Symmetry: none
Subunit: 314 residues, 2 copies
Amino acid sequence: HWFAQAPANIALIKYMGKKDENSNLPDNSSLSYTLSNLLSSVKLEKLPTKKDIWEPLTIPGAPEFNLSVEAQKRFIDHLVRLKEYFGYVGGFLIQSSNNFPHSSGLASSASSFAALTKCASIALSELTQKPLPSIDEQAQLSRLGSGSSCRSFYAPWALWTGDKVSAIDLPYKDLLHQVIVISSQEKEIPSRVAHKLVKTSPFYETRSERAEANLKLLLNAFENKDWTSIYQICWHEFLDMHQLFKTCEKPFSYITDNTLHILSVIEKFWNEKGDGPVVTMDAGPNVHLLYRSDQTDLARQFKSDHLVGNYDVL
Amino acid sequence: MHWFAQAPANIALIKYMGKKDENSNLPDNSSLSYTLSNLLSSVKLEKLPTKKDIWEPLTIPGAPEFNLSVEAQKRFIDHLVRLKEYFGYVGGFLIQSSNNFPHSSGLASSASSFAALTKCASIALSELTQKPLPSIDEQAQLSRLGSGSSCRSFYAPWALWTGDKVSAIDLPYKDLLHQVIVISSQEKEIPSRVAHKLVKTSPFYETRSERAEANLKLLLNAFENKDWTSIYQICWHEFLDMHQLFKTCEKPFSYITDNTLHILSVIEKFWNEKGDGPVVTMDAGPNVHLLYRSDQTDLARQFKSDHLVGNYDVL
């Protein structure tokens, strides 16, 4: 058997799967923070069969009850893609796992494909006696399965622009990451399906331009040690994306009155303390908080004054 | 052979009330309770040759209790089945549950009973299957499935349940004096479980969780400031809110009676007179709970002497 892990990552500027389906290049650049403590793992074992089998596992290592078709479909196809790259014929039992709380949000997607790419590279390289691809190359490969995952190969910050993904040196490195858990509604639209639906939003056409412009301002804000501007820009950024969800042909939303309540409280907090956490959301209901190394107490204060007894925090 | 475990009862200052999401099973609002470490439920498990469990409640002395309940038994056994399936075990058990508090008192035994069953089954099933024993948090989550209230009994002295997480919260007061004014039940009394269902028809039910959260924020702030007077008032407002739900539903019912009102009124007057008193709460039942600070022993004895003795039974 073979094993490997990869960290999840949270994007300040969203990629959103918006890409040129010709060259497979991203329509706009994306910048993300690597969450080194949240890991996805993948164990691979050969099967006497030529077909792969996917068996997700819970933290302890017991089978996870999961009846997914779409997610499974993509994961298997990526392994097959990798086996083709190495010219390998044979099936593998795939056992993936997360070290984080599970459910209640937490996108495993990116870190899971990164771990699979890493593990299959080790396994396949050994099995076929082929050169093991470099880190940069593995990112490129993982990219083919999950765009977001290519950013999980770099730390602490990853910048994905054009045909290149790499680590980027920015002024804030050891952040405190917390997730405000907002439970999903009855028939929630999957992150990947959201990426397709937003196409009918009148603001979609100009989405990448705004993303690029936001990135330029964001980088400048980092260059100036301007945490307040980082906050405001990332704020506009994720709201921009979510607005796409509610302005398409059949409006939908992850954000609810409950989400708005805590988001509002965070604003009042920033105004009150003159400082606060950087905030962002993905194509889901959870709200992510990012605090500086010197904000541990402020973080504890906000949590005690506004999160305790109202929201679950991861 | 056999396995034995115990769990404490707990009393909520902010009520969960069984108000939960139909699909996620998460509580609509958080809940806060005091762990009553002296009131205990016990569960003994003995393996049976068959595959089916048997429930035989017992009295404090150890003799079979006369109980013809179907609903209570169904829930309790299903919880064991649930636990056995979690461990992947196949086999029946003789379940012997008991409490260290009188039947006549009419105290809710559900919460501590399910916690005890969870703990005992966890031990028993762990050794029988050679699996590791589940952590406290995992056990609480499991117990949560048979009885919402029971997950709070896995922590002390205070437990805060928010979303799918339950934990001990470090609050200023500990070693409280707990007294219960036992008010005899009326014939045809609605069970706690059913009352939680009936309140859906109250016009105030829809907005009940908003008030509970608002009260929780105030209560927590009261604790931080060591403001006992505010804890009293908030808890007062909280339980009266819930009880108003019972009498404003489709078919109004009430555990509170003129007898109850007399003593509640007395407590208020006592508070006005002394400028200090007990924290008071009520569950979906007739009894009235008093909570005093460890430094209020004399005030408590004074109130029991001057207003409880000769009028109400007290535990």
